Amino acid sequence: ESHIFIYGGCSPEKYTPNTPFESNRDTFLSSVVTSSSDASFNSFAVGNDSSSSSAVFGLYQCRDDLRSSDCSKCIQTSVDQITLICPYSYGASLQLEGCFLRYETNDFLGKPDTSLRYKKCSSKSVENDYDFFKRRDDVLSDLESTQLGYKVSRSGLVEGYAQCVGDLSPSDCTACLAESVGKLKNLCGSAVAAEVYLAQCYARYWGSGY
Template sequence: MDIWTRRLQLLSAAAAAVFLLLLLHAPPPVSCADLDALIYKGCANQSFPGGALPPTVAALSSALSGQAGSTKFYKTSSPSTAGSSTSVFGLFQCRGDLSGSDCASCVSHATSSWRDVCGASVAARVQLAGCLALYEVSGFPQVSGVQMLFKTCGTGSGGAGDFEMRRDTAFAALEGGVATSTGGFVATSYQAVYAMAQCEGDLSTGDCGQCVTQAVQHVEVECGGAPSGQVYLDKCYISYSYYPHGVPHGGGTGGQQTSKTVAIVLGGAVGVGFLVICLLFARSLTKKKDDY
């Protein structure tokens, strides 16, 4: 083996090592399965007679799933039939940044889990990371649209002394962005804090703004200086996360854009590495020729 072949092998090994290093340090993409993660469930204490869901619930599930690919919010009723005297109402709300296919997949997963998480309850509410789907029997008691249903807060603290100021600035942007939002969805980032809000699609701009303001007040009290938090009210929810090393590209809410960026970076690294090898190889050949 001559010295030039040996040099080429060493350069190839170095390029491979650089590629592996970039891959190990690339941010992991968020899988679509994360959208189906259960956040919370709400089940009525009362059950349908006989301990079985009536056919109208299955019909409602099909109606909701059938619309999820074309809209982020939909509500409808499944009237009583000859086979069932029970009329049920239901709706779904997908997160505003989901694609049609991701929304459809999430709603299908949520509606199919009604029975698993709530049995034969006369009302069920399933909140996944990417969507909400619920049903309730006609005449089921209603609660205030700003009643808190669930909250979760991260452990520890945001670290930096001005963390809460950063978070509150992001919250203010959420509240201000509701007026111009599409479908009640607002997302923003400010100095390593990412925040998001989602209202039910049929809320007016004013009602959505009031709901988000209430949610912000709840999360400030409930989560304090925690690095992340989520508060779900009946008609809206907000979430925030602190990223010490900067908010991921795309806001950290979905993996599609992040994975594309990683692919571009890695592909570029491979291309540059290959170009460097070619240039060095050509240089070595020129040097070899000059030596003769």
């Protein structure tokens, strides 16, 4: 289901208890849970430019192909987990199968960012199967076409999934996924299955009966 751990990262810079930033962070996470109920994505800014007094900027993105109640469950789990693995971080991100949660002290909302956050290539490689690679190419090409939300793609026994985070413009979503696919090709050349997660999007492919 939608709750297994994919990756997490925290800022090296830590905040101290009983500061405005701690308060702002709590308020943010509380808002994320509230917003969960009836939106799959939302953006937030709490507070004022500063550091202990700093503003918080953040967002969450649930898998767009999942129900309301499932998005809330995932986000509640996410708020608990991100606190657990990143106790006193000024910045943190967390990707579960079902949802993504991010906050920082800098205003990253809406800005393109294609930096690599996480990737995994399957240990099993396909060899002597040109057809597999052509089908992968067709799938990845279709994923790259995404402008809003998510795409599921399929060609033969090759399946793919891509998602843009809801703070991106269409043009920026296309560019982000273009970089994802480039990365899938260049880091995981021969893998039967791989995933690449950038700052503002991700893309995965896998073999079905492979």
